[PDB]
Amino acid sequence: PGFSPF
Amino acid sequence: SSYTVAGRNVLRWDLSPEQIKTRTEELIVQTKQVYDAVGMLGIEEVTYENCLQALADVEVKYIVERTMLDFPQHVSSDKEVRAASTEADKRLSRFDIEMSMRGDIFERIVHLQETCDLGKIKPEARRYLEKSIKMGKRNGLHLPEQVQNEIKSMKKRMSELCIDFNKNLNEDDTFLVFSKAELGALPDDFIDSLEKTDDDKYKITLKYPHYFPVMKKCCIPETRRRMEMAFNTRCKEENTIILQQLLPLRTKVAKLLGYSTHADFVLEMNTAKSTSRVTAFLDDLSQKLKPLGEAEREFILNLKKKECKDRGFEYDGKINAWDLYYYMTQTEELKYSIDQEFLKEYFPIEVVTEGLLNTYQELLGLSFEQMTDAHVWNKSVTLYTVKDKATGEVLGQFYLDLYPREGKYNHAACFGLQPGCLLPDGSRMMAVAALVVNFSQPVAGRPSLLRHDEVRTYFHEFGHVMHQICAQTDFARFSGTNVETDFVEVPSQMLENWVWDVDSLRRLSKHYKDGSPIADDLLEKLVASRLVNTGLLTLRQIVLSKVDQSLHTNTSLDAASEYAKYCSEILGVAATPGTNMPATFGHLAGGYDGQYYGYLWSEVFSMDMFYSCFKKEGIMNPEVGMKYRNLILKPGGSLDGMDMLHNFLKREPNQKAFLMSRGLH
Ligand SMILES: [Zn+2]
Numbered sequence: 001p002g003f004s005p006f
Numbered sequence: 007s008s009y010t011v012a013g014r015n016v017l018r019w020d021l022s023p024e025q026i027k028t029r030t031e032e033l034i035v036q037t038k039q040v041y042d043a044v045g046m047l048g049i050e051e052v053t054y055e056n057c058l059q060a061l062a063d064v065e066v067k068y069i070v071e072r073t074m075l076d077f078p079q080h081v082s083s084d085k086e087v088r089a090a091s092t093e094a095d096k097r098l099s100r101f102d103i104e105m106s107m108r109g110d111i112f113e114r115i116v117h118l119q120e121t122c123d124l125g126k127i128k129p130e131a132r133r134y135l136e137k138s139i140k141m142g143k144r145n146g147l148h149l150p151e152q153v154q155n156e157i158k159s160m161k162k163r164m165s166e167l168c169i170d171f172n173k174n175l176n177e178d179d180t181f182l183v184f185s186k187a188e189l190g191a192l193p194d195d196f197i198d199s200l201e202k203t204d205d206d207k208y209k210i211t212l213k214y215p216h217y218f219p220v221m222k223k224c225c226i227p228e229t230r231r232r233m234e235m236a237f238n239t240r241c242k243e244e245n246t247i248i249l250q251q252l253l254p255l256r257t258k259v260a261k262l263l264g265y266s267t268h269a270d271f272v273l274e275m276n277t278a279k280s281t282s283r284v285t286a287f288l289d290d291l292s293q294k295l296k297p298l299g300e301a302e303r304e305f306i307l308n309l310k311k312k313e314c315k316d317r318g319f320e321y322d323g324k325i326n327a328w329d330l331y332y333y334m335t336q337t338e339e340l341k342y343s344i345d346q347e348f349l350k351e352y353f354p355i356e357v358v359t360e361g362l363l364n365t366y367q368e369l370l371g372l373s374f375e376q377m378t379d380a381h382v383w384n385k386s387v388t389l390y391t392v393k394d395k396a397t398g399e400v401l402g403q404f405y406l407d408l409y410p411r412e413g414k415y416n417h418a419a420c421f422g423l424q425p426g427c428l429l430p431d432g433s434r435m436m437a438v439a440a441l442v443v444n445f446s447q448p449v450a451g452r453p454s455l456l457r458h459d460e461v462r463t464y465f466h467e468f469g470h471v472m473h474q475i476c477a478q479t480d481f482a483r484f485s486g487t488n489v490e491t492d493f494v495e496v497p498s499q500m501l502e503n504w505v506w507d508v509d510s511l512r513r514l515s516k517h518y519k520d521g522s523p524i525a526d527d528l529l530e531k532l533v534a535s536r537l538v539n540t541g542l543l544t545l546r547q548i549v550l551s552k553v554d555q556s557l558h559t560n561t562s563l564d565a566a567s568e569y570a571k572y573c574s575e576i577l578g579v580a581a582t583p584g585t586n587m588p589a590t591f592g593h594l595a596g597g598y599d600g601q602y603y604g605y606l607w608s609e610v611f612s613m614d615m616f617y618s619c620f621k622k623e624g625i626m627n628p629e630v631g632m633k634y635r636n637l638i639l640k641p642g643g644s645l646d647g648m649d650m651l652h653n654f655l656k657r658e659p660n661q662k663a664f665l666m667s668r669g670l671h
Contacts, residue, residue: 001419001420001421001467001470001498002417002419002596002597003419003463004547
């Protein structure tokens with residue numbers, strides 16, 4: 001998984 | 007047992023640096039013997055039991071034992087354990103290549119698929135065959151000898167470069183020292199929680215609970231500039247050297263395999279298939295966001311000229327990289343009446359968690375319960391047991407690591423620790439996940455209050471937790487989140503829509519002092535804010551997607567100048583000279599290389615599944631939620647991404663629900 005860099 | 011939990015979680019977190027190195031050598035030998043046994047028997051001796059079943063039984067055992075050795079480098083408190091885990095990750099990664107570049111194992115799997123009735127094995131078994139052959143040809147196993155050795159040599163070096171890349175960002179410790187006067191407009195609950203230096207100044211770290219509150223609230227331009235400078239120059243020197251080697255190695259290995267560019271090599275395994283469709287998706291999307299970008303850039307500039315006129319600051323007439331987050335916050339305050347520091351008073355950490363779990367103990371038909379005195383890697387971690395509501399089947403477990411600390415993972419991701427596949431004895435292994443985020447910490451005697459974007463991240467990362475637990479397959483490589491990396495963000499971004507419903511927020515909201523809910527008209531203001539600054543926020547994500555494509559399609563280019571090129575051409579805000587953003591881009595070394603477009607690509611699918619199924623028949627309807635759990639989460643990697651979408655939507659997806667949710671055509 002992971003998340004966009006805010 | 008499929009209905010118990012005792013003995014199914016086999017993960018130990020009390021390993022020492024010596025025990026980690028010892029288990030790495032033991033796991034290599036005991037797996038080398040399995041691959042050698044299959045690779046030593048004759049080609050005419052292969053069968054489903056001694057070849058396919060033998061490899062399938064060792065992959066599930068390897069990836070579970072591997073987890074206890076390559077995960078402490080992300081959550082541990084001992085730098086020696088974080089060092090021993092990083093070295094164990096570099097050794098096991100090279101072992102994965104030596105076992106995958108086997109010509110003997112490849113020659114027998116291809117002969118097994120030919121001399122076997124494919125209609126007699128389960129549909130996932132033959133998918134395991136065609137995907138193993140497809141994964142073998144992508145390693146050049148059908149190429150001549152010395153070509154394979156050159157590919158295997160460059161893959162091993164690319165393995166060490168990507169691990170060192172994230173190791174530099176994880177172990178970064180650069181901080182900044184500011185005085186009370188230089189931290190203007192910052193609330194006192196934030197300033198009183200900082201380490202004070204001898205000169206009566208304060209210390210600021212580059213973690214998310216510190217960088218973002220400064221870039222959104224501090225009214226001193228010099229403070230915001232020096233913060234953005236140190237944040238976009240983390241490991242600028244050491245990672246630029248890694249990037250100047252990792253990118254050419256990917257080009258040389260992609261053309262040895264016959265592919266044009268490295269972007270073409272990774273795209274055929276994604277739902278977008280081709281790179282020409284990705285650039286058409288990103289260019290046509292930024293075309294519609296371009297009018298919104300001009301309008302938002304003009305309002306921010308006028309917002310800056312008036313503050314410089316009032317506060318007496320010098321006005322340069324440009325929107326610098328450090329002025330962005332500061333004035334997008336003011337646009338959220340003025341045009342939508344949203345105070346982030348006041349909204350967090352209604353979102354304490356326990357009320358959000360209690361409402362988040364209850365939201366999915368009804369939508370997906372699950373039963374969550376917390377474990378007391380659980381075996382964890384840090385005292386801040388809690389363990390939960392997931393059970394089916396109707397059948398009582400223990401589906402899996404997951405941990406919660408919600409607070410930042412030293413040496414911890416800086417971003418916010420989910421980690422699949424145990425798969426939900428079948429064991430050699432025929433039993434189903436309990437799946438284990440781990441939610442790792444860096445939320446705000448309790449200060450000023452208040453509970454840990456979360457901003458609305460922190461709750462959006464909480465719901466997002468919990469989607470990967472549900473996709474990991476509900477996934478039940480037969481093989482380890484098809485379980486969990488092992489889908490297309492441009493599709494894995496569909497189940498996570500799908501759950502972000504529950505943070506934008508008025509009735510769903512009313513269940514997630516409770517004031518930390520008197521328990522009063524959020525005002526009715528204020529829920530409307532918060533829901534209406536789902537498209538504030540949507541132009542610049544999404545344009546900046548398109549810039550990252552174009553740079554991700556550009557660095558993998560065109561060779562011999564500086565990553566810093568390529569990022570700055572797409573900044574002033576798409577976003578409109580110029581990149582600060584000297585700041586090397588790609589040197590901090592962790593996605594380029596964490597499996598998202600050449601596939602970062604998958605975030606915006608997956609949003610088209612989640613919006614289409616939410617507006618056409620959930621929002622049409624109630625977002626809390628369990629009949630729709632059960633379809634989503636069985637057709638999207640349960641198959642995992644055993645089905646194609648587009649096949650799971652056609653089974654849930656009963657049609658072909660489109661940008662209809664995606665465009666009107668953004669305010670476009
Ligand atoms: Zn994600």
